[PDB]
Design a protein. Sequence first.
Lengths: 424, 417, 420, 414
Amino acid sequence: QPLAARMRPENLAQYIGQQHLLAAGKPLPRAIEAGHLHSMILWGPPGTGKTTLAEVIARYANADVERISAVTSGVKEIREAIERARQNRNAGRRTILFVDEVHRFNKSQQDAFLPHIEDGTITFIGATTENPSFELNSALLSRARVYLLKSLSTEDIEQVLTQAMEDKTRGYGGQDIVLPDETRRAIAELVNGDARRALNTLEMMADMAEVDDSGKRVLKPELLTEIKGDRFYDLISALHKSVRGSAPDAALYWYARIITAGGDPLYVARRCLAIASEDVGNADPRAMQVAIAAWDCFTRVGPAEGERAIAQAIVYLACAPKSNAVYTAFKAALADARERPDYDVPVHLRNAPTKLMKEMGYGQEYRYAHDEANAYAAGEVYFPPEIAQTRYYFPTNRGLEGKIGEKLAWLAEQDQNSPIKRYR
Amino acid sequence: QPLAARMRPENLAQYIGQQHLLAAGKPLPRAIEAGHLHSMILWGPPGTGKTTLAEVIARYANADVERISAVTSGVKEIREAIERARQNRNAGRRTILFVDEVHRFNKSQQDAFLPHIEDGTITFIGATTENPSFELNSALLSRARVYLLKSLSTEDIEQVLTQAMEDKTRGYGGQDIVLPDETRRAIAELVNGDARRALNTLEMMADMAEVDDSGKRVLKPELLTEIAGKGDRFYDLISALHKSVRGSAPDAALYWYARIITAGGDPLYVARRCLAIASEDVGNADPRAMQVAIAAWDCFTRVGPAEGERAIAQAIVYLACAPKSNAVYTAFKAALADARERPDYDVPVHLRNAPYGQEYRYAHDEANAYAAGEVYFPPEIAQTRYYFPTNRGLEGKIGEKLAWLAEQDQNSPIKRY
Amino acid sequence: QPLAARMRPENLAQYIGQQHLLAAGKPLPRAIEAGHLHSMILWGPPGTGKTTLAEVIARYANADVERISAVTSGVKEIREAIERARQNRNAGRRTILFVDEVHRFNKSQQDAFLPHIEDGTITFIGATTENPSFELNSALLSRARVYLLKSLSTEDIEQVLTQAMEDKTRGYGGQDIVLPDETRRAIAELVNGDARRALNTLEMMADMAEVDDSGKRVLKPELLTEIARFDNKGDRFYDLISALHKSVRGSAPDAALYWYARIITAGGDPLYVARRCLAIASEDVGNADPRAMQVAIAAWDCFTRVGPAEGERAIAQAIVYLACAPKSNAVYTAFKAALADARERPDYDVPVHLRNAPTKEYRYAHDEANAYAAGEVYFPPEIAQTRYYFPTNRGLEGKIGEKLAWLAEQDQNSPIKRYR
Amino acid sequence: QPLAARMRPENLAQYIGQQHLLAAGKPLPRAIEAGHLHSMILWGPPGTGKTTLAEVIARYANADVERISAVTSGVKEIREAIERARQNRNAGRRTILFVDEVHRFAFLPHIEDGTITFIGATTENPSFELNSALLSRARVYLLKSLSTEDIEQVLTQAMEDKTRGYGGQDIVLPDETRRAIAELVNGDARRALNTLEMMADMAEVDDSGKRVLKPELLTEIAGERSARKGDRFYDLISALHKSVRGSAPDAALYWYARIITAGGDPLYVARRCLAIASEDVGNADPRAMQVAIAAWDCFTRVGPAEGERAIAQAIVYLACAPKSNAVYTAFKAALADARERPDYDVPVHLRNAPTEYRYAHDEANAYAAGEVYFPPEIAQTRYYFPTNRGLEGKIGEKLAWLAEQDQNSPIKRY
């Protein structure tokens, strides 16, 4: 999904180097390239390419990978990983069980892996930032070689940054984003040998940068300088409420807050569709289209321009005439269908009533509305008789509902005056 | 498709309950773990995980699964499962045949299995809610070891519910639905050790619950007690809905729609009728109707049922309220009839694909962009008319325009034919 | 793609008829069930299930199928299926070559297959209607056992039809189509044992049938007595489309519905017509009614999601809408002239004031009176007074003409003028 | 994927020409059909089927092919291909490394361990500028210019293929223009297909949807001598945007035409049409965005020459539309405030649950008159200032009427 993950190297020529370990002709790379698996502990600061290296080892070995983290894993996910390796072994395939931050596992959680190492179900790759010998079972260490990874040189971070800019398919290649050398170095200066933070930054900058008239984004050093709980739900809530309250200004403010805090702007796009049916409904049917259009736009354009499309929709909705009459009408219909008995469809409304059914229904026949005056079957009743006198929908007088209210009032008269009435 | 099917456990660690049989170290876990395949009979109450066990077994053994029910399965269905398996065996794969409610099988229906266990084409797994040693051939019971499953403890159901709530990819994880522990317990006590029912209950709660201003559904206890309270009938409802919309009755329209949704009808089936209604009963009295119906469907496609259903209800009310005209519908119908019943006349010379109207009259170069007096029919049926706009909605203006054009045609010095 | 293809049986429990050869037990169904390939000839009258039986054999054997015809296949295609087989062999895959009307190859052209039979690059299955021992070498009769199939019973046909009706994945199982038993009979008689034709009929009926208020189609006996989309498109096809577009361009809804009806009933793809509707919307209507493009997109969207007869109508609604729309080719002619200008003139450089980022000036329009930089010129100086777009007075273009004339006056009276 | 790439033969029954090497019975065909790989150097003029021969061989041997050129390939992408190939061997798959324009260069050790089977392609005698270490492992093969007959067939094959070609796309290639294409290209297959493709892309669509590829169009394509994506392209876009913002439909069409005829991608223009819809029109005309979306949807479903016209329509529409950057600047200001002001809590009455709320539908005019939706610290913040253009006239009046309700309200926050 994110840039960091997308940009993961697939072979040793893309891997930006821990050259003291991987320089061609050395022992590790000879093993990797031969596809010779051995369990390992990888020790290195954040973003040294521990995760990615493990993935590369798997591809040379023609093996599968499962990743887990000692941070967000307890007994449940350990057993899951194990069992999954087990099925993969029964299908005849090899498995690398990668474990991030292994030192966070306690002795007994560490032990759970040895029978599966011993018995060939998995090759184990553990990654940490702390010293391995300090806090891992010696039983583990005796079966897993330790390798020391160093933080990257500036040259190498810069290389990681260019690789991402140049890649036409997984990176920003052919995407009209310019990374000036001055800012490439300034990111290198800041991230202190951490490549993941470096890709994160780049992506953050790409997301935040404004588009000029040519469609180009230039990631200036000035932009760099410039930089799911109840707090989040409350922000969504204040946005919705501002829109409902016809307050476009505050609405933008809440939207901006959700955006800058890393909220998904598609999440907000979904709320705009909901709001289109619940707070506007038929006072303005186009609102649904404005909201669909903003979604469609987000989906085809860069983040900052996408977010402006959604912004446009928020202000459209904040400004629109307001009606909860479809919402209230549909809630009441639901309640009746859930609470009232299962009334049959009256004969005159059935798809193809047989002549027996017609006679069982006391001569009652479908009245085709198009063949009657005004294409209205004045006096007809569309509810089962047990609930003939039912109204759910009360148009407001806002927007288009003004005229809807008049049409309905005029229909209701045609009904009252009709000489042919259902059920009477 | 449903939440119950989507949440099938894939391996032993996802599998909740049956510890009396499955606790690590016992015989069965170990044979499963080794993926060694043996024919079996599983005995237990509905929703105890018989179905899901046969599938976990299959996953460990790297085998394909074929499911039949001695209830909902004819001879044809049964011959199909065996042949499918036989093809698998021929390509070298391993197949499990899971048979639900096996007991409801006469002995001479049971015989039609054994050749298929014996020559390895099938590994057989029977499920039954009733004791096996009664109505099953001893030939079959002599080949299929019997296993007994209990109904689930309350803590078991709670875990099944929690597992479904947390699973992000197959469940409701990262989908802004909350399950308070109280209603977690309430469902546990309601279902009485049936996990299938437990998950359906959960699923029904989610589909029913209202979405708050933050997009959250909270699955309240109130909502739960509230819940304990495809042939002719389905089609009659669809028909009631359509006729109500045609009849400009928005209230009755929402009622029939609501009856369809809550009896488990697919709201997209309704969104399809809405599209049909927009062209058959509204047409060009209001061309925007079609776009309202489209948008409702797209809206449903992007936010799911919770609020999708409401967007379709908006489309329903819109169409109910909309000016009515079947003019396009009857015109098309009559055009198709001319095409089927009158000669297949060649296209007139002036209208063929060619690279005082002696040949083609490019209409943009004439007065008012209209080639007055030009006829676009073959001469044998010149003057044919299909489209008679009503005077409702936009068609008042359209009728006015066509009447103006027909006048230009009458006054034209240049008439075709 | 079509019903007769989708409904190809794929195992012996799906294959209908030929039970004198295939009933549970006999030599043949046991060879097949085991998956043992051997060369074969199928003798039988057209429609019997030769093509499909070879497919069923292929599936039980895990093998590819390459289909050829002594009648319809030229030399290129004969060579192509041999080569594909060779390719499958080098990847360790079995391949069956099915050869229709194989009796129509001579004694010498039949010889050409034996090298590939002998070295096991092909399992050969021929299909004839004329007797095998009659026109076929013994060089070949001795490698292929002969099996004999029978014109299907009108009763086998009914089963074929109900199978397609009741198939949820491949057929009409979940499409709300009812096939009354009288229609089932009536189709059986008409086709006279050709299962493929029975299915083609069934399909014609379902694409024909009207949708009732409940969304059902009922395949009534009368629709039958009222009676090919995959044919190459010839002169007639192209004239029907030209007619349709020209009727629409000429604001004639009735003639337009007629040609459209003619195209559909001749098997034309309604999506083809939908394409033309997107073209007409920009070419013949343009900005006299920009909503026209949306009407045409919706008909397309609606055809994608719904039944044929229903989607065909949504398209009909777009057709009538376009016929009735105000007419303007002004965006069309404007764009043609703009293109002609780009191709025929020097490739003038972007003027300084319109460049993206000048080095070491631009009038941002929103900051001027009226959000108009009155007096600015957006062409290069060499072609400063160029004009392509001449709105008509129809539809929306009346107001657009008014706005444009008012802006030109604004340009006329401005104190600031580019290139002065 | 151009037609050229798309139409690559997949076996020897599809491969056109080089009959001197490939006719049934000769040593090479046999070695190809058998599936047996030997390294090789292929020499012959551009577009004679060197690249496609190599692919065809790979398919018979059930191998992958790694394509590399001595011209455009750095030391890094060379190493990459070797790594991939190794990853292939390890997965049980054979690999052909194809080397375009080998003449300008020691891959030797990867040939022995059969991790790579090597196929070089060259327009110059092999023995000339590459050593005999390589040459003693790789048979040389002589490739010839295609005959007119051969080139006509390559065109017809492309005309008749339903899947990868132009079969059933309503394109007619008259035999006269097929002949002339053969005449102009001088035995080069790739160039033939590129010319076909060019004509397809440029041919006018008639009333029936059909394209006829006539000789006139051929002569016109030949007279195109213009030179062939940097600062120039960006200023063309800039000028288009600016002309649209300035309500000049004529200049806009001219810049759009310059972008198209220079080979720019029309969907790139479509993306700028979406951007413009929100930034320069906004809610003076919210239908503008649906117009751009529709043009885009249209381009997706139809020809190039037609989709391009729908994008033209959208450009003219935007150019004539009332202008407003009110949403654009309002949002920019909201984002600034968000970023630069403190992270104020959501005011209690606007939170999702309590730990107050004035449901607006339950009040007069469905408006909570006097409610405030900002945090107290920045109450009265304004971002959105509608213009008096297009729909924004009525929107300003509505907002002015609303704010007057707020002002006269007995219930006020704070």
